Amino acid sequence: DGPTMREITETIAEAKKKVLDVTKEAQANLLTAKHGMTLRESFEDNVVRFLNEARDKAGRLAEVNLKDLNNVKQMVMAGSKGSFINIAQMSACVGQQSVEGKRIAFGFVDRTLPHFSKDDYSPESKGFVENSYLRGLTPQEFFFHAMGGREGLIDTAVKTAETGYIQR
């Protein structure tokens, strides 16, 4: 729905504002860590909760809005194929990509790609993919989601091999 989309897009806009305060807050040195956890580790743990909480609300939003005759929903309800995360990412938002448990890292000096300026910890700069699949990814998103994806292709081959040796 057009109305669902606007609600999804605000859902997402609010999370980016939460992020923006937590940012300004750490930027002024006002933020506290708590107990053996670094300031920057605190900051990241908080922005990633924010961004995940957004992805999720956005996706609950889309689920609700689809009707019983929605055939994706009809599969999920039966149990035969698909789950919430799939609705969500197709229809509402794909969300934060990650490599080794963390937001996309600065592999250029102080930046994730040359299209950004230095010291950028914002959602977009570190791998939040705001768009759904339907809508399409931007180029930067596209590349961070492939980073993501590659890590599971790798992790998958390592799993399969580790698992088989265990099993024997």
């Binding site: 040195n29 300031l39 920057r40």
Partner: protein
């Protein structure tokens, strides 16, 4: 805050020696028989929490670096609003996320650090 001395003749480094009699600090050389009286009584310092290097890189041409973000903050000195800004250039795990701004007219450095203990940088 140690400052380092060398032999006026040899240019090798100088080492501390107590003038047992008169209770004073000398630096001697181990190569010449040169000596000189010590300028301070501090011979050694170890900072466990340091700030040396937060500001490394502020250079005449900082502003021609197209990668740096810019803002419209005003400076304490020039009242100008042409800055570039960065984070701490120490590369610590345990660093703050505070910002360092460089006035591009008057070259004054200042921070967004509301608990500023810092005079210099």
């Amino acid at each position: 805050m140690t400052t380092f001395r060398f032999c006026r003749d040899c240019n090798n480094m100088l080492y501390p020696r107590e003038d047992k009699e008169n209770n004073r600090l000398l630096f001697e050389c181990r190569t010449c028989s040169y000596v000189e009286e010590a300028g301070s009584p501090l011979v050694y310092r170890h900072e466990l929490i340091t700030n040396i290097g937060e500001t490394a890189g502020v250079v005449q041409d900082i502003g021609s670096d197209p990668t740096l973000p810019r803002s419209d903050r005003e400076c304490p000195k020039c009242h100008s609003r042409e800055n570039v800004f960065f984070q701490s250039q120490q590369r610590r795990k345990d660093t703050s996320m505070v910002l360092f701004f460089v006035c591009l007219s008057c070259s004054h450095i200042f921070t967004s650090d509301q608990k500023n203990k810092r005079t210099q940088f």
